[PDB]
Amino acid sequence: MLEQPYLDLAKKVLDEGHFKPDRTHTGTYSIFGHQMRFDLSKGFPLLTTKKVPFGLIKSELLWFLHGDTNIRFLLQHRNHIWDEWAFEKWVKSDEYHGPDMTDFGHRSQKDPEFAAVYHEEMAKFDDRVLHDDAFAAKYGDLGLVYGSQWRAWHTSKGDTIDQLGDVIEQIKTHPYSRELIVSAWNPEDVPTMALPPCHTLYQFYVNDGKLSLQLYQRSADIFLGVPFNIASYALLTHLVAHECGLEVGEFIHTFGDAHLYVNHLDQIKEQLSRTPRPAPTLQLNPDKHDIFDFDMKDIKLLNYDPYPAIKAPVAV
Amino acid sequence: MLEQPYLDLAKKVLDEGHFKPDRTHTGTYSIFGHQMRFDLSKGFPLLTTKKVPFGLIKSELLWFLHGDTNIRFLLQHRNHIWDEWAFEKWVKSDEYHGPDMTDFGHRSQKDPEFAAVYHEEMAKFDDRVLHDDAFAAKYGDLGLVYGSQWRAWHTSKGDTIDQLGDVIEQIKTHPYSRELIVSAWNPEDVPTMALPPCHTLYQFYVNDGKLSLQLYQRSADIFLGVPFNIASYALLTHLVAHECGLEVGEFIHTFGDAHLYVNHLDQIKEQLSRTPRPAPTLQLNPDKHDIFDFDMKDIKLLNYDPYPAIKAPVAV
Ligand SMILES: O=c1ccn([C@H]2C[C@H](O)[C@@H](COP(=O)(O)O)O2)c(=O)[nH]1
Ligand SMILES: O=c1ccn([C@H]2C[C@H](O)[C@@H](COP(=O)(O)O)O2)c(=O)[nH]1
C-alpha cells in the first residue's frame, strides 16, 4: 500500500533502533540515515492506519506559502501547532505580570492544576493575539520560521530573498536545473533558535513532465511527527506541480535521526496491527493557479477513510 | 564487498535511468533520490575496481580543512582539480593580454592546437600563482568554495562563522545533538557562483561511541565524480572521529540527481565486469590530533591494490 514505507520505517526502528538519549530525556530508539519514496500518481500519502487532521496540514502549509510568521493566521483557523513558541515569549516578558510558568510544558504534564492555570494564560494569550494587533505584532510574530526562511531569507546586503518564488520560476524556465533547492538552514541564525529547522532542505526534480521533491529531515519523531511531515511535503509537491503545470511524480523522504520516543511503543505496536485501507485522493482548484494566493477551499482531500486516531503522550 | 553499493548504483542508473538533458548537453541517464551506506569499520571505501588517486583526495580535503580558498596550496602538491575556476578569471580579465580563450573547455576538447596554446596559458597561469603572491592573492583565490563555507561563513553582522570548528566542539560537549550539521548552501551566494556547491550539506551522528556522517549531494557524476566524493567524505568521517576520540561508524551517501553522462557508458560497463578486491585500510597519525593542523604524512592508505585506471572523457 501507499503508506507501507512509513509502517516499514516503524517496524525497522523497533527492530534495530538503539537507545539514544535526547534533549528531553524521554528516551528514543534511533536509526541514522533512511529514505522512503512515495509515488504520488498512486494516491495521497495521508495515513489511513490512523486519523491525521488534514486541516492542520493545509493551514500550516498555506501559512508557510504566504511567507507569514505570525501565529494569528493559524489561530484564525484554530491551528495551535505553533502556539507555544509564541506563548514562551509572552511568558518570559517583563510585560507578563501573572503566575510563574517556568517552562510550563514539563510542569503542566504533571501538575493537574498547573495545566489549568497554564491553560488560562494560553487561551488568554491567544485571545490578545487575535484581537489586539499591537500585541500580535509583538508576541504573535515568531520571526525565524519556515514562511520567512522560504520566502524572505535575509541577506548581508540588507535585503531579502524569496527562495521559493525564484525556484518556481526556475522550474518554469529551466526544468532540468540540478539546483532547484530551498534551504531552511542558516548558520548564523541556527544557534539562537529554540528549535533549529527540522525540515532542513528540499530539492525539486523534473523529468518526463513529472515533478518530484526530495526532503532532508535532520530529525524525526516517528510516531507523532512523521505522519504530518509526509503530508505537508507531498501536498507542497502537488501545489508546485499545479502552479507549474506539471504532473506529480514522487515524494522522496530522507531522514537523519529517525526516532521513536519510548512512551509511544505500545501505540506504534497497535498501529502496526492495523491494515492500510486504499489511499485518499487530492483535488485542487483548476481555475486558481497562483498557489501563493491559495486558500483552504482551493484544496480538498477525497476518500480519506482512516482508522480511529491513536492517542499518545507528547512526551516529545 | 565494501564498494558494492557504488557498483549497484551504476547498475541501477543503467537499468532505470531516464534520459535527461543537462547544462553541457552531453546527455545523462538520471535517477533522483538514492542512498548508500558504508560501514567504515570494515575498510576504506576507495574503489578497488579502478585506480583512484588518493593523493588528490588528501590534499583537497586538507585544503578545505585549513579554510583555504587559494589554489596555490593545491598546485604546491600538484593538485589541479580547481585550476579552471581560477584560470577562468584570469582569462576574462583586462590584465589578460593574450590569445582568445572563449571558454577554452569545449574548444580545447576539439581543436588540437587550441589544446596546446590553451595549455600554455594554464601552465603559465599556474606559474604566476605559485611564484607571484600579488597574482595568487588576486587570481588564485577562488573565494566562495568549501574551505570558506565550512570555516568562514560570512554573516550580516559583518563577521564570520567557523561552522565546522563549532560543530566538532558540539560533538565533544553534546555528542547526541541532532543538529550537528554543516551547510555549504548559502541562498544569497548561490546565483552568482559558476558552480553551486554539489556537496550541499552533511550531518554527523554519534551513537555507541561511533561517529557517523550523512552527506546530501544534490547532483552527482556516477563515473567520474562519485568515486572521489565517497573517498573525501569517508576520510573526513575518520578525521573528525580521530579529533573527537570516537570510533568510526558509517558513511551514508544521499543523492539527488545521480547521473551517467552518455560518453561513459562503455567505461562503466567494463568497470562492472571487474570483481572488487579486498578493501584498503586507513591509518592516521596517533600523536597528532588537531586535524586542522594535519598534513599529508599524517594520513596513510594501506593495502590499496586496485585494478587499472579507466580512462573516460571529461565530457562532464
Ligand atoms: O514537524 C516536525 C517537528 C519536529 N519533529 C521532531 C524532531 C525531533 O523528534 C524533535 C526535535 O528535536 P531536535 O531535532 O531539535 O533535537 O521534534 C518532527 O518529527 N516533525
Ligand atoms: O565532486 C564533484 C563535483 C561535481 N560533480 C558533478 C555533478 C554534476 O555531474 C556536475 C555539475 O552539474 P550541476 O549539478 O551544477 O548542474 O558535476 C560530482 O559528481 N562530484
Q: Kindly list the domain boundaries of chain B, sorted by start residue.
A: 1-316
Report helix, strand and coil shares of chain B as percent, to nearest 5. 40, 20, 40
Considering A198, A201, A265, A301, which one is annotated as catalytic?
A: A198
Q: Interior CA angle at A219 toward A102 and A179, to 5°? A: 130
Ligand 1 centroid to A219 CA: how many Å? 5
Q: Edge to edge, what strands does the sheet with A18-20 contain?
A: A18-20, A28-39, A247-261, A210-221, A199-207, A181-183
Beta strands A210-221 and A247-261, pairing class: parallel
Q: What resolution in angstrom units was achieved for this structure?
A: 2.5
Mutate which of B221, B260, B264, B268 for ligand 2? The one with the most ligand atoms within 8 Å of its CB, which is: B221
Of the candidates B161, B142, B18, the residue with the CA atom closest to the CA atom of residue B81: B142
Which homologous superfamily is A1-316 in?
Thymidylate synthase/dCMP hydroxymethylase domain (3.30.572.10)
Q: What is the DSSP letter of A282?
A: E
Counting atoms of ligand 2 from 1, which one is nearest the CA of A178? 16
**Gap from CA of A221 to ligand 1 centroid (Å):** 6
Ramachandran area for residue A158 (φ above 0: left; ψ -120 to 50: alpha; else beta): left
d(CA B106, ligand 2 centre) in Å: 17
Q: Name the minimum distance, in Å, from the CA of A87 to any CA of chain B.
A: 24
Question: Helices in chain B by DSSP H: which ranges?
Answer: 4-16, 54-65, 72-76, 83-91, 104-108, 112-131, 133-135, 146-151, 163-173, 226-244, 265-272
Residues of A in contact with B207 (CB under 8 A): 18, 20, 30, 32
Query: What is the position in ligand 2's atom list of the atom closest to the CA of B28?
Result: 9
* H/E segment holding residue A224: none
Whether chain A has a CB inside 8 Å of the CB on B221: the answer is: no
Residues in chain A: 316
Q: Does A33 touch chain B (CB under 8 A)?
A: yes
Residues 6 or more apart whose Cβ sits within 8 Å of residue A100: none
The residues pairing with B214 across neighbouring beta strands, listed in sequence order, are B203, B252
Which among B217, B155, B68, B236 is positioned nearest to A191, based on CA atoms?
B155
CA dist., res. B170 & res. B152, Å (int):
17
Nearest atom, ligand 1, residue B177 CA: 16
